[PDB]
């Protein structure tokens, strides 16, 4: 109800990172979620005030 | 996962009041949280439109 039917702001609820979406899949006696998330990359230092 | 690794918008979940931060500590067979929150103070009336 939270991951699929909208976007989630709870940390580490729908995947690891900033959540984007989720896709459900059926499974025998269970369910599988395919969470699509967003992760940063190469960074750089700067001087801030 | 929620109070420590981020900021929580849920009400009366990560302590009482507007949540600011949280700190974890270990105890024999358990965990202890130190929630740091924000609470209003002395107020005054005003006329509004």
From Swiss-Prot, chains A, B:
Result for mutant: residue 42 to H: In strain: Kappa/B.1.617.1
Disulfide bonds: 3-14
Glycosylation sites: 45
Domain of life: Viruses
Functional note: Subunit of the fusion protein that is processed upon entry into the host cell. Mediates fusion of the virion and cellular membranes by functioning as a class I viral fusion protein. Contains a viral fusion peptide that is unmasked after S2 cleavage. This cleavage can occur at the cell membrane by host TMPRSS2 or during endocytosis by host CSTL. In either case, this triggers an extensive and irreversible conformational change that leads to fusion of the viral envelope with the cellular cytoplasmic membrane, releasing viral genomic RNA into the host cell cytoplasm.
Protein name as annotated: Spike protein S2'
Species lineage: Viruses, Riboviria, Orthornavirae, Pisuviricota, Pisoniviricetes
Encoding gene per record: S
Portion of the parent chain present: 1030 to 1078 of 1273
């Amino acid at each position: 109800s939270e991951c699929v039917l909208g976007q989630s702001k709870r940390v580490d609820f729908c995947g690891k990172g900033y959540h984007l979406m989720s896709f459900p899949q059926s499974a025998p006696h269970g369910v599988v979620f395919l969470h699509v998330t967003y992760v940063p990359a190469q960074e750089k230092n700067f001087t801030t005030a």
